């Protein structure tokens, strides 16, 4: 139940001036910029991702993230891919992206970067140790299965 990763989820949205500098028109649609605060966006995001989605319904999710939260479809798709499809890490992605002013957030558990994927395929003991310290064994095994199945 408890996890020390909760620090990445509990970032105070009121400390993030809206819209954040990193949130550009190449990533977000006009609807996004009509939210009144970071908290309002995050609360709508929570409502979307709390919906009923079967494992095969990434397209419906991406459409709802476009229509309700103003996230562009190609960006939602890229995020979903780097989260290994774990919808529970979507809020974490935006809070850390916005707080850090960096996309993707480079040092967040559950958010796989290009460097992380290269470490995974490297066969290097040290790189794998750092990688599992970041994401954990369970996520590392899921990521390997994604690569094995030609999903990445």
């Amino acid at each position: 139940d408890f996890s020390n990763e909760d620090i990445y989820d509990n970032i105070d949205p009121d400390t993030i001036s809206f819209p954040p500098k990193i949130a550009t028109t190449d990533l977000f649609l006009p609807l996004f910029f009509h939210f009144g605060s970071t908290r309002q966006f995050m609360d709508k995001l929570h409502e979307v991702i709390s919906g009923d989605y079967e494992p095969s319904q990434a397209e419906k999710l991406v459409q709802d993230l476009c229509d309700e939260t103003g996230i562009r479809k190609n960006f939602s798709t890229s995020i979903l891919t780097c989260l290994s499809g774990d919808l529970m890490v979507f809020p974490r992605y935006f809070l850390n992206m916005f707080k850090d002013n960096v996309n993707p957030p480079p040092n967040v558990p559950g958010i796989w970067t290009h460097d992380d994927d290269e470490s995974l395929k490297s066969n290097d003991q040290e790189q794998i140790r750092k990688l599992v310290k970041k994401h954990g064994t369970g996520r590392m095994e899921m990521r390997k299965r994604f690569f094995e199945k030609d999903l990445l």
Binding site: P55, Q57, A58, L61, V62, T77, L80, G85, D86, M88
Partner: peptide, 7 residues
Amino acid sequence: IRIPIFN
């Protein structure tokens, strides 16, 4: 999208 999703 082929990425399967979950909670």
